[PDB]
């Protein structure tokens, strides 16, 4: 009934912003639609593959701020295999190299290549991570799809194939589908294009001993029962002295203050009194989120290892129904596993098969790229379709359709009257991830509680030390990679 | 409580299809959210105004089925008046004209705005009313802005520039908003053109008389006390033998079957069990609403015709905050008065302003286009800022962005379970008008009764007699509009003769 703060959502986000006012000393309640907390991590535990991430599950050097949660909660990470060769699938042929970078070995599509991800980092260099609306060029790039972009700059079908395959493998989307200014922000805002396609060194590191769902499995024991399962909110009023919010199973919660910690669009199912700003009423139908099936193959062992490859795949085209796999053995060698991710209209379109039917197709496809008959006898399956969920409405994150970040962007995190706005869509650094929920739960958190006179301004955001158990190395680039010309650049010269 | 169908919203598609199962001897409840029936029809009444729509408002030939429902409910239209000049304000200057097309003079742009239009009916043709995913070219053409094929067709700004007021005008978007596929669907789907853009002949022809809200006011009074005011939906259960219907203010209604009558991402408000399935649980959040300002400025007469101007502006430039007008004076002649919009990023860019400030401005711009200094001295305003509605999302009607259509459009009528799905969003014809509100009403109602075994298959679509009232004359074009070269098609003719 009657507490502090009413936390919308039990997801990473909701549940950061719960732990820290609880720690502050206030009366906090989290209201949770499912009958589970995690919201878009999900660890699924059986005895074939003793834990799985079947929602969020990576995370990597600076994203400091979950790493630093998990921690506190009593959790480990472990590395991903990256220690054999990659493989890159083009044109029905397997290229296995090292690096994060698959080689390209034409001069032409070299210079194209290069280019290209330069290009992204340096158009990113000017869009402000809090304020994507204000880069210069922001209306130009925000009126484009990321489609036109690539269309533009890429001189050759095979950079304009594997920037394509980037697109989809980020943000799950089309790259007709996104803005280019959004998307550029996307990658700039998790530290650019090595930052973020990156294993070692990179957002794709390490997984948690024991899966990730034990960040807010382990926030709601401390919080005991505060938090309230199967409670999907239904109607806010804010029209009197304390906020009124209701749930679907006819309970009525009061609040001085809300956390929404939601997918924004999820704002949808929420009916407002009085009625939300004109911005945020339509801003709330203009984001949808990605569409992709998480997929995991058990086999009887790690067999990829003897032919010195890694488990990693980047497999170019249309027939493949999985762009790009990892390793997802435990640490300790067993319950041997390939992860997989069927991207956005993929998604769509396998749906349709059986579970058995999609299992065969990833089989076939890995005994394929990884050139072994061993990939065809799996031990075990696990997938899911994040793309049926009422409570996310996709993964891996909202993404913004053209035109859409410049005219309603600035109102994501704007309060409404005692609602303030959490969920990782909301955060600076690494939205879209784990990280980003943990940042935008603790900054909507500090808000109420700079609202409420308890801690000044400019504690509202703040700085996270980096982690001793994950350093970050720095990007680097060589002398060659900056200063070589494109193909438009080469030409301009001869 | 207990009923055979509910119908989840009250506006006009809701509203027809309510009557239509009431008329045909079925028990019938509509919730509507609103303490009022319409949607986005609203007819305000005043003392200043008498009535006006401050919504939809406009009917025209081949709407059939809106002119045949309000015509039963008593209601008559009269016509827009379009007697004297239009004006199109171009780079600061007002040139009068006649006809639905401004005239352009210069050969080369001629040729390039004849192309333009053509080219867009063109496409239309190869695009199924009731199919639009089914074109031979629908994902080049889905995975593409209005932007983008603006940039490829038009040779000319000036082209680019009204083809680009044109789609603002249509869709209450931004050209890079919306998918090319679907607003070429949504352009042939209101007869092409000619039929969408024109008053004389066309979707603007004629208002009704004492406002286009009587035709869902008529149809609640008709169906009495079934009709449930301040009823926002927000549960429905399909997992028993009858559906549940659960409603805000803590009431429950049992039924056989629901018509969702209410804009396709609005169902999101509705929490459902079980959950919806995958297509259209993703769909219902990637189909958002255009953004418009509807304003009317009163005057003490309508001067603009004794400059043989009849009030019609189509008037392009980022300045100007309304793009097009009508003369919005009473059939009587009196309550003089120019209706203008505001529209896409403007009607988020000026909502920051009073009502007295865009009065002010919309003053302005009028007397600069009309050359006319009464245009400063308006005796009245009302405006509707649809962008604001909770419970319609904006106005007119439902957008697609770039690669939505083909991969979702499907799913858009299809039932799920025993929910049906009406609205104007899923007419096959002038979807986004009130005709297609009442088309889609309509039929979803039959589907029901053809579930009933209460009619045939072949039932559950039908035709529509022409009105007499509101006769259609056939779209007509000249042998030069039909085979004057676009301008690349003229400079490869320069070519092959220079070869
Ligand atoms: C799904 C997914 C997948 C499959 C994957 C992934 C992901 C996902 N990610 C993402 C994450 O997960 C996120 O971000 C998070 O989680 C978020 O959080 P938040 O913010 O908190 O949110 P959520 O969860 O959603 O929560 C919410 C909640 O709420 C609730 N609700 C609703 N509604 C309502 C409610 N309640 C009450 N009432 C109402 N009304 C719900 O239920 C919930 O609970 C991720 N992340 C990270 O970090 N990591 C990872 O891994 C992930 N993932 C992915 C990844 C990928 N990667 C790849 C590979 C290679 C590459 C890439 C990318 C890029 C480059 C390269
Ligand atoms: C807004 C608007 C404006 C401003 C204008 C216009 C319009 C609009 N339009 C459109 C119409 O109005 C529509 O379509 C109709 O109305 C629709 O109907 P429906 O489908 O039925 O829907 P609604 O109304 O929305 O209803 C719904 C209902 O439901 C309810 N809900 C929600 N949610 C819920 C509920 N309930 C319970 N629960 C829940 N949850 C609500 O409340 C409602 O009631 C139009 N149309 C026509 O026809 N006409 C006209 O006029 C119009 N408008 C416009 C026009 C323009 N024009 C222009 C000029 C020149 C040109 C143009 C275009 C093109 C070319 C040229």
């Known amino acids: 009934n009657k507490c502090d703060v009413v936390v919308v959502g ?41 834990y799985v991430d079947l929602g969020g599950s990576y995370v990597g050097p600076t994203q400091n701020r979950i790493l630093r949660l998990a921690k506190e909660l009593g959790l480990e990470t472990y590395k991903v295999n990256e220690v054999e060769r990659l493989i890159h699938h083009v044109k029905g042929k397997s290229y296995p190299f090292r690096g994060p970078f698959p080689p390209v070995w034409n001069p032409i599509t070299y210079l194209d290549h290069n280019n290209f991800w330069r290009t992204m980092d340096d158009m990113g260099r000017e ?13 130009e790039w ?33 790259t007709h589908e996104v803005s280019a200014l959004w998307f550029l922000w996307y990658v700039k805002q998790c530290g650019g294009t090595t930052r973020i396609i990156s294993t070692t060194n990179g957002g794709q ?70 009625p939300l700003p004109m911005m945020r009423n339509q801003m709330i139908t203009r984001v949808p989120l990605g569409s992709v099936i998480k997929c995991i193959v058990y086999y009887k062992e790690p067999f990829w290892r003897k032919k010195d490859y890694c488990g990693t795949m980047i497999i170019d085209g249309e027939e493949a129904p999985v762009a790009y796999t990892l390793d997802d053995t ?3 060698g067993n319950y041997a596993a390939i992860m997989g991710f069927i991207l956005a209209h993929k998604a769509r379109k396998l749906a349709r098969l059986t579970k058995e039917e999609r299992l065969k197709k ?75 929920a943990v940042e935008a739960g603790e900054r909507a958190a500090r808000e109420i509680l700079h609202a409420m006179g308890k801690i000044p301004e400019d504690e509202i955001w703040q700085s996270e030390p980096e982690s001793v158990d994950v350093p970050a190395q720095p990007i680097t680039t060589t002398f060659l990679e900056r200063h070589l010309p494109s193909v438009p650049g080469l030409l301009r010269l001869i």
């Open 362 to 436: 990833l089989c076939e496809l890995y005994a394929k790229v990884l050139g072994s008959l061993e990939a065809l006898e799996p031990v075990h399956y696990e997938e899911k379709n994040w793309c049926e969920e009422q409570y996310s409405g996709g993964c891996y994150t909202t993404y913004f359709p053209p035109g859409i970040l410049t005219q309603y962007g600035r109102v994501l995190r704007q309060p409404v009257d005692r609602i303030y706005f959490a969920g990782t869509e909301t955060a600076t650094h690494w939205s879209g991830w784990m990280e980003g």
């Open 10 to 50: 039990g997801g990473i986000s909701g549940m950061a912003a719960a732990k820290l006012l609880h720690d502050s000393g206030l009366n906090v309640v989290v209201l949770e639609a499912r009958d589970r907390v995690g919201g878009r991590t999900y660890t699924l535990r059986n005895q074939k593959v003793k």
């Open 142 to 174: 925000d009126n484009m799809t990321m489609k036109e972009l690539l269309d533009k700059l890429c001189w050759t079908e095979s950079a304009k194939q594997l920037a394509t395959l980037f697109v989809n493998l980020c943000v799950t989307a089309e």
């Open 127 to 139: 869009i402000p991570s809090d304020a994507p609306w204000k880069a210069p060029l922001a209306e």
């Open 205 to 274: 590191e390490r997984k948690f001993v024991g899966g990730s769902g034990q960040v807010s499995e382990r926030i709601m024991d401390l919080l005991g029962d505060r938090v309230k399962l199967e409670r999907p909110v239904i109607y806010i009023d804010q029209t009197r002295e304390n906020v009124l919010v209701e749930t679907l199973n006819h309970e009525m919660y009061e609040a001085k203050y809300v956390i929404s910690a939601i997918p924004p669009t999820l704002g949808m199912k929420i009916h407002f009194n009085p």
């Open 330 to 332: 435990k640490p300790e």
